[PDB]
Amino acid sequence: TPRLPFARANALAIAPDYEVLRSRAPISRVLTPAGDPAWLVTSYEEAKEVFRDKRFGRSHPAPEQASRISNAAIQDGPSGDFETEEAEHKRMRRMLAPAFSAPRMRALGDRIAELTDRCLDDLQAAHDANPGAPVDLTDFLAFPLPVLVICELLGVPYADREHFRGLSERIARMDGGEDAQAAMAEFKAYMLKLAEAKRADPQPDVISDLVAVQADDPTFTDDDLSRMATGLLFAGHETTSTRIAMGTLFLLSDTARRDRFAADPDGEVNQTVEEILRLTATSGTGLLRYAHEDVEIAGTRIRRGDAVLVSSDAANRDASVFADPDEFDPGRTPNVHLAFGTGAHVCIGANLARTELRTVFPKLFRRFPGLRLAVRVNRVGGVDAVPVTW
Numbered sequence: 001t002p003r004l005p006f007a008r009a010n011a012l013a014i015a016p017d018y019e020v021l022r023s024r025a026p027i028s029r030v031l032t033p034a035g036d037p038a039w040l041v042t043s044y045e046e047a048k049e050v051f052r053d054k055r056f057g058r059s060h061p062a063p064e065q066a067s068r069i070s071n072a073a074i075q076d077g078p079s080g081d082f083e084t085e086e087a088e089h090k091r092m093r094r095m096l097a098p099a100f101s102a103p104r105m106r107a108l109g110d111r112i113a114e115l116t117d118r119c120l121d122d123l124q125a126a127h128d129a130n131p132g133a134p135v136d137l138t139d140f141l142a143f144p145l146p147v148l149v150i151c152e153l154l155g156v157p158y159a160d161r162e163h164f165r166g167l168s169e170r171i172a173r174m175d176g177g178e179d180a181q182a183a184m185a186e187f188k189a190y191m192l193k194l195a196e197a198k199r200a201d202p203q204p205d206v207i208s209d210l211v212a213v214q215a216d217d218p219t220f221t222d223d224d225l226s227r228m229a230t231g232l233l234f235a236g237h238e239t240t241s242t243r244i245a246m247g248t249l250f251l252l253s254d255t256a257r258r259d260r261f262a263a264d265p266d267g268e269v270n271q272t273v274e275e276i277l278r279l280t281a282t283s284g285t286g287l288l289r290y291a292h293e294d295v296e297i298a299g300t301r302i303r304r305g306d307a308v309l310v311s312s313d314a315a316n317r318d319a320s321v322f323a324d325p326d327e328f329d330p331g332r333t334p335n336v337h338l339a340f341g342t343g344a345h346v347c348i349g350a351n352l353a354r355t356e357l358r359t360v361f362p363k364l365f366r367r368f369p370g371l372r373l374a375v376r377v378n379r380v381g382g383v384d385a386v387p388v389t390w
């Protein structure tokens with residue numbers, strides 16, 4: 001039985017195991033990092049189907065009987081009450097709608113531009129301080145930028161950015177240790193201090209939105225509020241960071257690609273970002289669902305209670321949908337992909353993520369015309385270094 005995570009030989013490639021499994025069945029039995037059996041979906045059509053099929057949810061009817069995936073913060077095992085999941089999910093999407101609305105995204109887009117400029121300043125200063133040496137674009141740009149965007153999204157006071165990033169770094173390990181466990185308490189406590197700050201002076205940010213939800217709905221507790229804020233950090237930081245890093249690696253690993261983008265960044269950026277999203281593959285597992293009844297799909301009998309891991313990474317390389325699927329081709333004319341999922345759980349931050357990526361790459365290649373480059377994905381798995389010079 002195949003055992004996740006699958007191995008690969010270089011950062012830009014996808015693990016070869018997925019195509020081996022896909023060629024035999026769209027849905028295959030695998031073992032998770034936690035050692036339990038799950039179905040892995042590797043084809044585009046079946047992944048799309050599971051994403052859109054309400055018979056698969058995040059909850060499990062009898063969670064004690066369920067396969068575990070890992071010990072990660074999210075996408076790790078059963079989540080939420082089975083009887084109430086759809087209602088709770090609808091309530092979550094509604095409460096976060098203001099935060100991702102167009103006026104809020106207009107403001108955040110301006111802050112993203114400014115934050116990008118400041119990160120590129122740090123990259124240039126590191127290069128000037130160590131002339132002749134590569135500098136790590138991940139350290140100065142890919143890793144910090146999306147967590148600073150999360151600060152602006154949540155409403156973290158400017159003076160606290162370092163404090164916040166320190167707490168997040170300690171909970172981001174997901175290692176179950178004693179430090180990480182006390183860091184989660186300190187982090188949730190910090191979320192609750194900020195909630196009181198927003199009650200004093202409401203702002204156009206997520207924490208203010210969530211205290212407004214509480215004043216109209218006493219069932220939404222401080223723990224619910226701090227859990228939601230914590231979950232946006234997990235969902236929105238390293239995901240985005242790895243696409244900045246890996247997208248830079250795609251563009252720099254073939255000079256012709258770099259030069260095409262650099263020659264017309266404003267014209268090329270939308271389609272370039274979509275191809276980065278299609279090809280970047282960093283998952284150790286997949287997007288987690290449990291069957292809420294027996295479901296037959298593509299000749300596989302998925303029984304009630306079974307774990308299903310949807311591999312968007314693998315779905316996005318299905319050769320029946322994307323010809324030459326391992327080739328980086330920003331001109332792919334239909335380039336709908338499942339990097340953000342689809343259906344009811346489609347990434348609520350997709351537009352924010354696209355705004356981050358679409359802002360960074362034109363600024364990066366305008367600022368640094370000479371820019372050039374100098375084995376398994378972890379559930380927790382950090383962002384690869386991208387050493388560059390110019």
Ligand code: HEM
Nearest residue numbers: 235236239240287339340341344345346347348349352353
């Ligand atoms: C920009 C910051 C981001 C934020 C704040 C964010 C937030 C979220 C949230 C709250 C969800 C859950 C939606 C739901 O269950 O209704 C979600 C789902 C999702 N996100 Fe994001 N996200 C961000 C960026 C990204 C990036 C860059 C990617 C990868 C290219 C990504 C991939 C996904 C996927 C695949 C799902 C679906 C998970 C599932 O079906 O279980 N997200 N995101």
